[PDB]
Amino acid sequence: MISQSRYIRIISGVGAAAPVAGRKLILRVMTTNNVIPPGIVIEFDNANAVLSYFGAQSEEYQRAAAYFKFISKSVNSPSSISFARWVNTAIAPMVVGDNLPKTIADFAGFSAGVLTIMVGAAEQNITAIDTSAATSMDNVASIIQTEIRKNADPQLAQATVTWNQNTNQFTLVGATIGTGVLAVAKSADPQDMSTALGWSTSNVVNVAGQSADLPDAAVAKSTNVSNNFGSFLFAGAPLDNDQIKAVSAWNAAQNNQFIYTVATSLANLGTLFTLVNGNAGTALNVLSATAANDFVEQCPSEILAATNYDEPGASQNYMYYQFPGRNITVSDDTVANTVDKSRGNYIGVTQANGQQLAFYQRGILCGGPTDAVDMNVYANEIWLKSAIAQALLDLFLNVNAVPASSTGEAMTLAVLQPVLDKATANGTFTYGKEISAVQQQYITQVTGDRRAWRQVQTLGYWINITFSSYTNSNTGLTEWKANYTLIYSKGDAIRFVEGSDVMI
Amino acid sequence: AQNNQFIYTVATSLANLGTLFTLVNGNAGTALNVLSATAANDFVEQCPSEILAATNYDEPGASQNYMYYQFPGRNITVSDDTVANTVDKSRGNYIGVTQANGQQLAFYQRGILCGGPTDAVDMNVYANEIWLKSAIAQALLDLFLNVNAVPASSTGEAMTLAVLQPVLDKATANGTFTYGKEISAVQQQYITQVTGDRRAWRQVQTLGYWINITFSSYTNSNTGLTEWKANYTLIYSKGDAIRFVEGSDVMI
Amino acid sequence: STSTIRTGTNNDILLDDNGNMVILRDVEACAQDVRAAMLMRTGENIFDVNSGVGYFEYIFSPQKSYDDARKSIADAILSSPDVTGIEQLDIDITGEVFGVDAKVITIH
Amino acid sequence: MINVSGFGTGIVIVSASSFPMGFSLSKFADDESPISSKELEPFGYEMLYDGGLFAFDKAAPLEVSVSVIAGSEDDINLRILLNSKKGSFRFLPGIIPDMTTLVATLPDGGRTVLSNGTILKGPAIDTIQNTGRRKGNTYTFVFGSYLGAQTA
Amino acid sequence: MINVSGFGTGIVIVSASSFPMGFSLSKFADDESPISSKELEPFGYEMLYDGGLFAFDKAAPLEVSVSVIAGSEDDINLRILLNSKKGSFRFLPGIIPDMTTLVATLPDGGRTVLSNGTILKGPAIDTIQNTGRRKGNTYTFVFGSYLGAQTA
């Protein structure tokens, strides 16, 4: 008798709900599971969704469970996660197109005239398939498989089919590996399965057969699909030294965009540090051989994804957080010194008598002398670059033209002002630190102006705008470009304490 | 053919709406009401007329919604969501029950009118326009009656604007004008197209109205002679009434 | 501290797969309670008149101020067993919709 | 090439009871400023002990001064307005009895309207300076409802 | 030789809500000072009873005044900015409604940015001198934070 909902609607919802618009600093996992198509990335907002999609036995549920149940000093949670697939072996072409719970065994009464159409190297049609029995979906899959086997075209000669129960979709897999493309098209015949079945209907994922690829190429392709994440890693078996070195080099090719986290054994640190000396953006973590992995390498990613940059005082430290679930690795002073000289991260125990407490200590990160070493600075630069880029693109998209005159310079400064104010609010910019003589010389060398060090000392930053002209490579023509330079005092976190006491 | 002068109210059964709406699609100024076949007529179609005649325009806060009024005498017609959706798509009015329980309470459902895209659809806007037109005409006739001559210069048209001023004061105190409304890009372009002046939408957003006066020359059809006429344009932000309430809640 | 029985998006008892009613603990019970209280509207409660939300007298009807509706909603959100104080209230009122947004504070 | 001359300006003043139809101003004095206003100051600010800034809104009137040649009929009309008394005639709620509306036209075409206000102060008898010339009378108005109309 | 000429300067003003993209000032009046300001007093002092001196820190605002030719586009833009009322719309916590930012470019190349402030007083209608022309409208701002960048 008419619903009060159509007049009044309250959504309610549990507390600690914070809508966010901007780049998400969320974890991304590269896996070798067969369920995930190669060219598509997926996201989840809860561990229950991950369980529904994958299942308890799969270790990805373990990773998601560990990832999600984290609380920072200010009460926050990652609230998101990303997944993508890496292919390490040549694969046959395949198709998949279902996500909604269409399968309630409606194949009954559809036995007459099944006219599904497959499009590939040669157009071919499928004979009528009996489905009125509809005993079980696996039986249906076997029936369609046999009907496909009745064909002689070699990629469909040894074709297979599969049904998953957690997620509802049908998969077709060809025979030949590494080459070939398949497609499916609906027909004018109303008595068809392709319309009712997932594929050939609206959003359907299609896969092209292709050889195995190096991991760096896989992550590059994943970024090309979408780059809204941070601090990716590789799941499953440990990678080889050469592959890790290549991935680190590729990450260093991007100029301070993501964080590469790996897990390695204690005895293996000597090899990696020599290989991956420099090449900033890579984090090394110590893994315990005796016990279970406990997924130590996720810690920096969880810490990074937990923080938010809209609220004041966002800058955090990585030196003292406690993870009760994880397992202790090192307990000796000399061992800690050796690992520190090798520039690694770990969890060190102290006391263990009466009480017991350990924390993920080293917030340091491997890299060259020029680039930032500590991690909080790295994260702050990531956020800052994202914000500046977004502001500049907004300026270009709103104003009709930006003249190459002083007024254009004024417009650019006016647009950049709010981002700088927010940065000062967060804590990425800091004020009051003293400047050494060599630092003063460095600053005066970078920017031609003297006395800028006074403003970077007091206010915390210094910016300039300059426009010039240039010629591009693709076309012989010339355009006008704008050059800006930004210098600021990096944020810092308390790490060590000095004290003194005298009685008079 | 008349322009925002009256309201035409009719009564019909929901079986007849499917054909009647197509015939009278557009043609702003008419109201469609649903009549019950089983019971007595109870004169359902008089409700918009009663509501319109009840209100007065001299006192402040006069504009009122039409979709929440209870008529105990009348009889209930529809009690389902699907039929309500069909009737709404057919642009009809009715008294629908939402309780059917220990206490009973229904109300006139929608205050919409059939008409073209350009003309106002809600009833309250229609009534406000009627009153505004009447007041403007009365003021201008008083101007002509009480003045020996209105010169075709700046001073005369300033006199005209000064004479109109109290009417707009009464209107903005009444509730037919609205201030603080948001403006979309398409609406801003439409306003700038209607009147040659840019930055009038600022005036419409702040005060709620914008007026201009201009006098020109023309010739009438009845006699070959020429005469001087004044052209004025008025743009205002229409009033609104609450229809749907949407809320949210967060524990922290 | 309080507790209640879980209900679905429509205000009916929702049963799990096993077939057992669930007694929700705090916090979530606060959310369900505050939603139900905000949906109550005045005059329906026998044995206690003048409790609820005066929709037809303060919101739907034409009004002069709109402050009184804010007062009524603020009172309705209170009187819950665990609600302590109200942090935000918005009352947007844009176009046809009457926007409402709120965040509450609980001991737990 | 921007023209800022004040030649050709005209003002029409209409009242509620004294002049239900209103009159016109065309004879503006020479030695005094024909029309002038004080500064509209509708915002304020306060300092916090932290060192920050805070801004708010406060009520602000609007004052206008008009000067005419002594002995003209416009001076007589303004004298009638000045001499009329609020306590006289009838009253009806919330109108500031005998509300006066002013409309001014710029030579270019710019126009402005002011309402919810009344005459405030002015002279009673003419004055003679040492040169033997009657001074230009000046009158002051106040307005509460600035209608922000500046149409071209 | 030091070139202290002011010709060729420009002003850009950005508002949080009313003018999200901002506009530019180019027509500066002639009879009145184009850009003016008051002194800054961020320090104070107090005397001790032994004859010494003590110096402390004080909170001080910054006031700026600009003037433009009446009837230009900049004048009406500033009029809109003045007539905008802070009662409407909303704001992020501790931000002040309509945080207006000003950027001024000197002819040689140096410039300055001012933020955390708003307009607070201006004219409402035009004033006419006895000479027969219109005064240059002047507006006053206030700011809480500033900067300096005098290199180009």
Nearest to D31 by CA among D136, D122, D138, D130: D136
CB-CB under 8 Å, D12 with B155: yes
Q: Cβ distance D27 to E124 under 8 Å?
A: no
Q: Is A280 helix (H, G, I), strand (E, B) or coil?
A: coil
* Separation of alpha carbons D25 and A291, rounded Å: 99
Q: Residue A309 in contact with residue A383, Cβ under 8 Å?
A: yes
The pair phi, psi for residue A207, each rounded to 5°, is -125, 135
Q: How far is A10 from chain C (nearest CA, A)?
A: 7
Please give the C-alpha separations between residue D69 and each of A292, C2, D18, D77, D134, in angstroms, as whole numbers: 102, 83, 22, 12, 9
Helices A375-398 and A298-306: crossing angle in degrees, nearest 10, is 50
Instruction: Round to whole Å and give the CA distance between D101 and C26.
Output: 64
Q: Which residue type does D43 have? A: F
Instruction: Measure Cα distances from B35 to B16, B91, B122, D57 in Å.
Output: 10, 14, 21, 55
Helix (H, G, I), strand (E, B) or coil at B33: strand
The DSSP result for A181-240, as a single string, is --EEE--S-SS-STTTSSTTSSS-EEE--B----HHHHHHHHHHH------EEE-SSPPP
Give CA–CA dist B18/B21, Å, rounded: 6
Q: Which of A383, A364, A386 is nearest to A280 (CA)?
A: A364
Q: H-helix or E-strand containing A356?
A: strand A355-360
Q: Please name the residues in contact with A330: beta carbons below 8 A apart, sequence gap of 6 or more.
A: A266, A286, A336, A339, A346, A347, A348, A349
Which helix (H) or strand (E) segment is A119 a member of? strand A117-119
Which residues have C-beta within 8 Å of that of residue C9, sequence separation ≥ 6? none
CA distance A212 to A218: 10
For residue A368, the one-letter residue type is G
Residue of D nearest to B205 (CA): D148
Distance CA C40, CA C37 (A): 5
Instruction: Compute the distance between CA of residue A129 and CA of residue A132 in angstroms, rounded to an integer.
Output: 9
Closest residue to A14, CB basis, from C31, C38, C55: C31
Tokens 């006491």 belong to which residue? A501
Phi-psi region of A390 (alpha: psi -120 to 50; beta: other; left: phi over 0): alpha
Contact D53 E134 (CB under 8 A): no
At B48 the three-state DSSP class reads helix
Distance between CA atoms of A314 and A491, rounded to whole angstroms?
11
CA-based R_g, chain A, Å: 29
Backbone φ and ψ of A219, nearest 5°: -70, -35
Listed in sequence order, the residues at least 6 apart from A425 whose beta carbon sits closer than 8 Å to its beta carbon are A312
The minimum CA-CA distance between E61 and chain D, rounded to whole Å, is 8
Q: Name the residue among E102, E88, E91 with its Cα closest to residue E144.
A: E102
The number of residues making up chain B comes to 252
Closest residue by Cα to residue D53 from B76, A38, E63, C100: E63
Q: For residue C52, give the nearest of C44, C62, C60, C42 by alpha carbon.
A: C42
Q: Hunting for tokens 């996500």 — which residue is that?
A: A99
Which run of H or of E encompasses B47?
helix B47-54
Question: Residue A33's CB: how many other CB atoms inside 10 A?
Answer: 14
Q: Which of A366, A316, A361, A365 is nearest to A491 (CA)?
A: A316
CA distances from E110 to A418, E10, E24 (A): 21, 11, 17
User: Do the beta carbons of residue C96 and residue C105 sit within 8 Å?
Assistant: no
- Angle formed by the axes of helices B123-146 and B154-174, nearest 10°: 140
For residue C55, the chain B residues in CB contact (below 8 A) are 245
Task: List the alpha helices (DSSP H) in A117-203.
Answer: 137-149, 154-157
Query: How many whole angstroms separate alpha carbon A284 and alpha carbon C20?
Result: 49
From the list D12, D115, D147, the residue facing B158 with the nearest CB is: D12
Q: Cα–Cα distance between A187 and A195 in angstroms, integer?
A: 9
CB pair distance less than 8 Å for D112 and E125: yes
With beta carbons less than 8 A apart as the criterion, state whether A186 and A176 touch. no
Kindly report the backbone phi and psi dihedral angles of residue A48, in degrees, each rounded to the nearest multiple of 5, phi listed first. -65, -40
* 3 state DSSP class of B4: coil
Distance CA(C73)–CA(C101), nearest Å, equals 11
Interface of B with C in 86-125 (CB under 8 A): 103
**Amino acid residing at A376:** N
Q: What is the C-alpha separation between A418 and A382, in angstroms, rounded?
A: 17
Give the end-to-end CA distance of chain C in Å, rounded to a whole number.
8
Q: Which of D70, D50, D62, D51 is nearest to D120 (CA)?
A: D62
> CA-to-CA distance for A368 and A388, rounded, in angstroms?
25
Contact A93, A182 (CB under 8 A): yes
CA atoms within 13 A of residue E99's CA, in its CB half-sphere: 19
State the DSSP H helix or E strand holding residue A458, giving kind and residue range, or none if neither: helix A452-458
Could you give phi then psi for residue A442, rounded to 5 degrees? -60, -45
Residue identified by tokens 């001080």 is E60
Rounded CA-CA distance B84/B91 in Å is 10
Q: Find, among E102, E75, E72, E78, the residue nearest to E12 by Cα.
A: E102
The CA distance from D102 to D86, in Å, is 19
B103 contacts: CB under 8 Å, gap ≥ 6 = C44
Chain B residues 26-65 within an 8 A CB cutoff of chain C: 60-61, 63-65
DSSP A371-404: S--BHHHHHHHHHHHHHHHHHHHHHHHHSS---S
**Rounded to 5°, angle at Cα C21 from C16 and C23:** 115
Encoded tokens for C84? 């302590």
Expressed in angstroms, the distance from the first to the final Cα of chain A is 86
For residue E44, give both structure tokens. 């104070």
What lies within 8 Å, CB to CB, of A77 at 6+ separation is: A68, A70, A71, A306
**Closest-CA distance of chain B to residue E146, Å:** 30
Q: Which residue numbers in chain D precede an interruption (C–N > 2.5 Å)?
A: none
Write b or e for each residue in A350-366: b if 16 or more Cβ atoms lie within 10 A of its Cβ, otherwise e: eeeeeeeebebbbbbbb
Cα–Cα distance measured from residue C51 to residue C43, given in angstroms and rounded to the nearest whole number: 7
Q: What chains are in contact with D, requiring at least 3 Cβ pairs below 8 Å?
A: B, E
CA distances (Å), origin D109, targets B150, B212, B214, B217, C95: 18, 11, 11, 19, 36
Are E111 and A410 a contacting pair, CB within 8 Å?
yes
Own/partner contacts of C63-69, CB < 8 Å, gap of 24 or more, are C63/B61, C64/B60, C64/B61, C66/C91, C66/C93
The DSSP symbol for A460 reads S
Smallest Cβ–Cβ distance between E88 and the set B180, B199, B202 belongs to: B180
Do residues C38 and C76 lie in contact, with contact meaning Cβ atoms separated by under 8 Å?
yes
Q: Which helix (H) or strand (E) holds B205?
A: helix B200-206
CB E133 within 8 A of CB E53: no
Residue among B65, B182, B251 whose CB faces C27 most closely: B251
Q: Do A406 and E105 touch (CB under 8 A)?
A: yes
Angle, CA D138 vertex, CA D135 and CA D144 arms, to 5°? 175
Chain breaks of chain E after residues with C–N above 2.5 Å: none
* C-beta of residue A209 within 8 angstroms of C-beta of residue A178: yes
Report CA dihedral (B37, B40, B42, B48) to the nearest 10 degrees.
Answer: 10
Backbone angles phi, psi at B87, to 5 degrees: -65, -40
DSSP conformational letter for A6: G
- In whole angstroms, what is the distance from residue A121 CA to residue A366 CA? 50
Provide the token pair at A48.
């229950």
Task: Enumerate the residues of chain C whose CB falls inside 8 A of the CB of residue A2.
Answer: none
Dihedral class, residue B219 (left if φ above 0, else alpha if ψ from -120 to 50, else beta)? beta
Kindly state the tokens that stand for A347. 């969890």
Half-sphere exposure of B130 (CA within 13 A, CB side): 16
How distant, in Å, are the alpha carbons of A6, A23, B178, C59, C71 from that of C100? 16, 28, 21, 12, 13
Measured from the Cβ of residue D76, the count of other Cβ atoms closer than 10 Å reads: 11
Distances in Å between the alpha carbon of E80 and those of B206, D80, D146, E18?
10, 36, 13, 9
Give Cα D134 distance to the centre of its chain: 22
E35-37/A160-164 β-pairing? unpaired
DSSP E83-148: H--TTSS---TTS-SS--EEEEE-SSS-EEEEEEEEEEEB-SS--B-TTSBBPPEEEEEEEEE---
- Helix (DSSP H) and strand (DSSP E) numbers for chain B: 7, 7
Cβ atoms of B105 and A2 within 8 Å: the answer is no
Query: Partners of C61 in the beta sheet?
Result: none
- Give the chain E residue whose CA is nearest to the CA of D111: E125
Distance (Å) from the alpha carbon of B3 to chain D's nearest alpha carbon: 28
CA dist list (Å): A162 to A99, A115, A135: 15, 20, 16
| Strand D53-57, strand D43-47: pairing | antiparallel
CA distances from A331 to A292, A293, A363, D31 (A): 18, 18, 18, 96
> Which amino acid type is present at position A359?
F
Distance CA E125, CA E123 (A): 6
Q: Supply angle C-alpha A113, A119, A122, rounded to 5.
A: 105
CA angle D114-D120-D126, nearest 5°?
Answer: 120
Among residues A357, A383, A359, the alpha carbon closest in space to that of A305 is found at A383
Smallest Cβ distance to A10: which of C10, C27, C38? C38
C-alpha A382: how far from chain center:
13
Angle ∠(C26,C29,C30) on CA atoms, nearest 5: 90
Three-state SS at B22: helix
- Three-class SS of D73-130: HHHHHHHHHHHCCCCCCCCCCCCCCCCCEEEEECCCCCEEEEEEEEEEECCCCCCECC
SS3 track for chain C: CCCEECECCCCCECCCCCCCCCEECCCHHHHHHHHHHHCCCCCCCCCCCCCCCCHHHHCCCCCCCCHHHHHHHHHHHCCCCCEEEEEEECCCCECCEEEECEEEEECC
A 10 A CB-CB count for C66 gives: 13
Give the number of other CB atoms < 10 A from CB of residue C78: 14
Q: Are strands B244-247 and E43-47 parallel, antiparallel or unpaired?
A: unpaired
The two tokens of residue D107 are 């030579």
Check if the beta carbon of residue D63 is closer than 8 Å to that of residue D146. no
- Give me the helices (H) in A254-403, please: 269-275, 298-306, 333-341, 375-398
Minimal Cβ distance to B155: which of D24, D101, D151: D24
Phi, psi for E105 (deg, rounded to 5): -110, 125
Token digits for A59? Answer: 């270790």
Question: Which is it for strands D137-147 and D62-68: parallel, antiparallel or unpaired?
Answer: antiparallel
A421 CB neighbours in chain E (<8 A) are 115
Query: In the Cβ-directed half-sphere of B115, how many Cα atoms lie within 13 Å?
Result: 20
Give the list of residues 6+ apart from residue A350 with CB closer than 8 angstroms, or none: A357, A358
Query: Do C and D share at least 3 CB pairs under 8 Å?
Result: no
> Distances from the Cα of D52 to the Cαs of A455, A458, D55, E73, E79, in angstroms?
20, 18, 10, 33, 27
Interface of D with E in 16-55 (CB under 8 A): 30-37, 39-45, 47-49, 51-55
